[PDB]
Ligand SMILES: COc1cc(Cl)ccc1CC(=O)N1CCC[C@H](C(N)=O)C1
């Protein structure tokens with residue numbers, strides 16, 4: 001679990017969104033595993049606007065932050081689950097690192113702010129759903 005709170009928005013993994021998130025839906029994209037819902041209170045998380053390929057992510061399964069090098073946002077094949085059939089997930093970035101299913105939602109950050117959230121993993125790899133292209137999160 002885990003979410004990004006910026007302005008009047010909440011960004012979460014689409015597969016972990018709540019009834020409240022869906023009743024306050026702003027935008028969702030199955031192909032990216034993202035859902036954005038509206039909030040009454042303000043969020044102060046700074047979203048990075050950069051092409052950083054290094055950063056730090058939070059791993060709840062280890063109660064630790066890990067530094068990682070990560071790939072450019074791209075279309076990567078992701079195997080089936082109780083949430084999705086097997087498909088290409090877009091805007092996905094991989095790093096060599098530890099993750100487990102309950103790690104989805106952990107934030108990846110660079111020196112410029114929030115880059116994205118944990119969305120996939122397996123085989124010593126961890127995948128992050130990029131959010132740096134969602135320019136409207138600030139305005
Ligand atoms: C961090 O997630 C891990 C990690 C490991 Cl090692 C093993 C399994 C998972 C879970 C995972 O990748 N899923 C299930 C939830 C939806 C995801 C998606 N974006 O399509 C795919």
Ligand SMILES: [Zn+2]
Pocket residue numbers: 048049050051052110111112113
């Ligand atoms: Zn950056």
